Amino acid sequence: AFTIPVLKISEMTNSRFPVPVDQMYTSRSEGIVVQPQNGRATIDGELLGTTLVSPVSVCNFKGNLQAEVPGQHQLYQLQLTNLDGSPIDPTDDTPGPLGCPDFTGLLYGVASQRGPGDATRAHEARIDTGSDTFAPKIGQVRFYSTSSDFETNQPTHFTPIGIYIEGNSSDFNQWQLPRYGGHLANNNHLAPAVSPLFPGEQILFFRSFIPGASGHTNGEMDCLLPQEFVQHFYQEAATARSEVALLRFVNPDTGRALFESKLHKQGFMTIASSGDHPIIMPTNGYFRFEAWVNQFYSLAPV
Amino acid sequence: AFTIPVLKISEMTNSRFPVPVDQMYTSRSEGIVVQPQNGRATIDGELLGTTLVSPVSVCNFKGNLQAEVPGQHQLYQLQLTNLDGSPIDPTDDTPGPLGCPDFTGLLYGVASQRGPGDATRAHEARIDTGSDTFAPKIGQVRFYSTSSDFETNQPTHFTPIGIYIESDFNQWQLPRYGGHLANNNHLAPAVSPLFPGEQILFFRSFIPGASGHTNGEMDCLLPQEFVQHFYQEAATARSEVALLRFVNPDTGRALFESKLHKQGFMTIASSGDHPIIMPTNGYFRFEAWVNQFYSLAPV
Ligand SMILES: CC(=O)N[C@@H]1[C@@H](O[C@@H]2O[C@@H](C)[C@@H](O)[C@@H](O)[C@@H]2O)[C@H](O[C@@H]2O[C@H](CO)[C@H](O)[C@H](O[C@]3(C(=O)O)C[C@H](O)[C@@H](NC(C)=O)[C@H]([C@H](O)[C@H](O)CO)O3)[C@H]2O)[C@@H](CO)O[C@@H]1O
Ligand SMILES: CC(=O)N[C@@H]1[C@@H](O[C@@H]2O[C@@H](C)[C@@H](O)[C@@H](O)[C@@H]2O)[C@H](O[C@@H]2O[C@H](CO)[C@H](O)[C@H](O[C@]3(C(=O)O)C[C@H](O)[C@@H](NC(C)=O)[C@H]([C@H](O)[C@H](O)CO)O3)[C@H]2O)[C@@H](CO)O[C@@H]1O
Structure with missing residues (x-):
């Protein structure tokens, strides 16, 4: 019933x-x-x-912190995984990764990391879901932060909080x-x-x-x-x-x-x-x- | 069944x-x-x-930003409401307001505000659930922020993110x-x-x-x-x-x-x-x- x-x-x-x-x-x-x-x-x-x-x-992201983008300070490149840890697969019958934001704007939140070991760090971050480089379907997403306290090649999580x-x-x-x-x-x-x-x-x-x-x-x-x-x-x-x-x-x-x-x-x-x-x-x-x-x-x- | x-x-x-x-x-x-x-x-x-x-x-807070606490830089005093907006009622048969953290630690998150009008602001914030003055049962909770960009008497929300270890x-x-x-x-x-x-x-x-x-x-x-x-x-x-x-x-x-x-x-x-x-x-x-x-x- x-x-x-x-x-x-x-x-x-x-x-x-x-x-x-x-x-x-x-x-x-x-x-x-x-x-x-x-x-x-x-x-x-x-x-x-x-x-x-x-x-x-919904509106969370996970992935590897690939590098800081050349030329632009405290803009960071994520290589996404799915929220479940599995690799991004652009052949999935979805528009993009599950939970990916479905609106354009400056999505405000916190990017956090754990690693190496149990060392952790977290700071405010913004993701522009309307920018040209925003391409979660192929796992490419950048975030801006007012902090440079991020480690390369460590697991990174973006927790959404609101809009900027x-x-x-x-x-x-x-x-x-x-x-x-x-x-x-x-x-x-x-x-x-x-x-x-x-x-x-x-x-x-x-x-x-x-x-x-x-x-x-x-x-x-x-x-x-x-x-x-x-x-x-x-x-x-x-x-x-x-x-x-x-x-x-x-x-x-x-x-x-x-x-x-x-x-x-x-x-x-x-x-x-x-x-x-x-x-x-x-x-x-x-x-x-x-x-x-x-x-x-x-x-x-x- | x-x-x-x-x-x-x-x-x-x-x-x-x-x-x-x-x-x-x-x-x-x-x-x-x-x-x-x-x-x-x-x-x-x-x-x-x-x-x-x-x-x-769970681990969220809402309330009025009553004041920056006297003698304490960028420590702010909340007067809580329940998360559903209803007033805090200390006579309730609960240990504290629903969703209140049930652990001691430095709870890290973001304090956000909307007001006056549709003007908004949000900054990182920390709530020490182990501190003497942490008294959510009666709507009394303080948060620390590195920002001073908070308005008194505007609705304020604490969104939890994680834990801060000192x-x-x-x-x-x-x-x-x-x-x-x-x-x-x-x-x-x-x-x-x-x-x-x-x-x-x-x-x-x-x-x-x-x-x-x-x-x-x-x-x-x-x-x-x-x-x-x-x-x-x-x-x-x-x-x-x-x-x-x-x-x-x-x-x-x-x-x-x-x-x-x-x-x-x-x-x-x-x-x-x-x-x-x-x-x-x-x-x-x-x-x-x-x-x-x-x-x-x-x-
Ligand atoms: C937000 C912020 O700036 N907070 C810092 C702390 O740094 C944060 O945490 C770190 C672990 C790291 O993730 C960083 O990116 C964050 O911003 C800071 O914590 C110290 O940070 C330093 C610099 O990286 C070291 O990581 C230190 O860790 C160790 C170390 O020196 O290796 C680990 C080590 O295991 C530990 N000793 C033992 C035996 O456990 C030592 C130990 O604490 C010190 O040597 C003291 O004897 O530290 C982090 O402790 C923190 C203190 O500097 O300040 C802000 O809190
Ligand atoms: C995080 C941060 O610091 N970002 C700032 C902006 O400040 C944030 O947003 C504000 C709305 C406020 O909630 C503040 O606490 C936040 O930190 C900042 O935005 C300006 O902030 C000022 C300071 O209060 C004013 O709110 C301004 O709004 C108004 C104003 O000055 O009254 C409203 C007014 O309607 C508008 N005029 C018209 C016709 O629309 C004017 C006018 O555009 C400006 O005065 C011209 O400068 O603005 C907010 O715009 C922002 C700009 O200073 O910088 C960061 O982003």
């Missing part, structure tokens, strides 16, 4: 950045192609894009996919763009405000499914008995329900709403699976 | 620090009391200690949640193997080190995924022990057995301090309800 976990919004994890979900949010997404590559799974358990199941891995706003073209765009293969390459194996097809409906997003390290940004990061749903679908692999799972957002405090949403088989939710706005609800509220409906099932607004 | 999620070791999350599990590990635990407060859940779904269900929240990291030494002037209460109980020839099975991560010599060993009793699953399923324990088999899907054969105790920890038949390295695809599955005197085959 098909099920979804009982979770308060505040208990959900963002599938595109390793922080909790802050609020439900809906938008028209006017003139935007919504094509995130993280937090993509079908309801019958097939992972898509660069989606992995670990809730703490310089105030120019490299600015955080959550819907702009990076060129996973680098400047000269076209993306492939992409999870498809999503949009609402039924009149009156909009996609329901799970939004987090990720930390900012500099500049002005609300750090808005919208995922299609909380990571817990991704994990659950993967784990259960339940048969999708129709194209749409009807879900109901219920308030355990009153015992009564607030709205319904359509969970599409391909892994995204829609609601009957119009306009760009937060969907604020009683904090103990959660979704419950009600029935198998089709893509023409008609929802009351809100 | 009672189940365990199908997960490779490499897909598991540490329940005491927000990073993947690296290996299974077992220990004699000579001379130590094993009493972690995070990653504590009964197999029927009751969360204990400071355990929360969010897999990205208060040396002791994963089994519980902090004083109420600070040096109060004693801990409402602790999840210590655990130990009671049956001869058994040891606890731990899920071990090597957390990042920011400085100094450290392997960053962090041992939890259950991966966060098991905590989440038990909480969700809330299935009834039909006995004091759930017998599990760690099976290799590649061969269809069992590699070893483990006793999953009702109160939320695992033991195996083994002797000594060592990793338990197994075929990558291996995973635990429920076999049967047994008692606490069930005799396990070694390894």
